[PDB]
């Protein structure tokens, strides 16, 4: 009621699917590429394009409308940019899992060190929970040197 | 569920074997070596 009318159907959330954002997808939702660390341009206001405060990312000011959605600052959610890295770096949160993956796969071609021919290992792939299965596999393949 | 949680916790907030809160703590934590 405090929301202006919109023709899109109103629904509720039934499921939250977590996951990772692919590099391709990050670019697909981005509205601008970010390159220059200087916020201001010539210090004459009017947010220089490509700045950390490029107006395509959104408005936090009552008098400038968003150049992407046309809505005021109250309704405008903000839109993401993207920053290309010259060299790929690790995500700090996932390092101990990355480490676990290295001992599981071949460091040349990347194949799982055990097969369904191994009887105990064939039992471990049946485990329905992904986390426990992954751990059960790694518990076997760890000693495979 | 919630009614059970409050019904057990509220008396604890006003209260040679171990008794009272230190004994209660051993149970919920399921200590392998009780005092």
């Amino acid at each position: 009621s405090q929301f202006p009318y919109s023709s899109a159907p109103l629904r509720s959330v039934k499921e939250v699917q977590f996951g990772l954002l692919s590099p391709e997808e990050i670019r697909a939702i981005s509205v601008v590429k970010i390159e220059y660390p200087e916020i201001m341009d010539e210090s004459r206001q009017r947010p220089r394009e490509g700045g950390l405060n490029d107006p395509k990312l959104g408005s936090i000011d009552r008098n400038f409308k968003c150049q992407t959605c046309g809505e005021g600052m109250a309704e405008c959610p903000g839109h993401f940019g993207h920053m290309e890295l010259a060299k790929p770096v690790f995500h700090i949160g996932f390092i101990p899992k990355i480490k676990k993956v290295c001992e599981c796969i071949c460091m040349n071609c990347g194949k799982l060190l055990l097969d369904e021919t191994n009887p105990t290992m064939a039992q471990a792939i049946r485990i329905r929970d992904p986390k426990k299965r992954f751990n059960a596999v790694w518990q076997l393949c760890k000693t495979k040197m | 569920g919630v009614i059970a949680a409050q019904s057990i916790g509220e008396p604890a907030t006003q209260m040679n074997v171990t008794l009272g809160v230190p004994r209660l703590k051993e149970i919920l934590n399921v200590a392998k070596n009780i005092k």
């Binding site: 202006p4 919109s6 899109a8 939702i29 903000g78 995500h91 | 409050q6």
Partner: protein, 93 residues
Amino acid sequence: FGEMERDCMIAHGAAGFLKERLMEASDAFRVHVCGICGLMSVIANLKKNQFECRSCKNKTNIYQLHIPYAAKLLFQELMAMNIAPRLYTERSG
């Protein structure tokens, strides 16, 4: 309205009251989601009445949600750490 207050309303079974307190009487916010990819990536111009999730090339399968602003904020902070929280409005099974 702290965590302990929340529990008391559950015990009373007053589910309707608890919803209203934490939304209409506070920081209620409307977002748009894409019916295909489940992200809050929709660009919505309401006076032009045109919507598009550029990633899915989808202008038809789009839903609106009412969620707390602080939840919208939370999801954008998760996106900034490369975590994708996909909001779907139906149970696949």
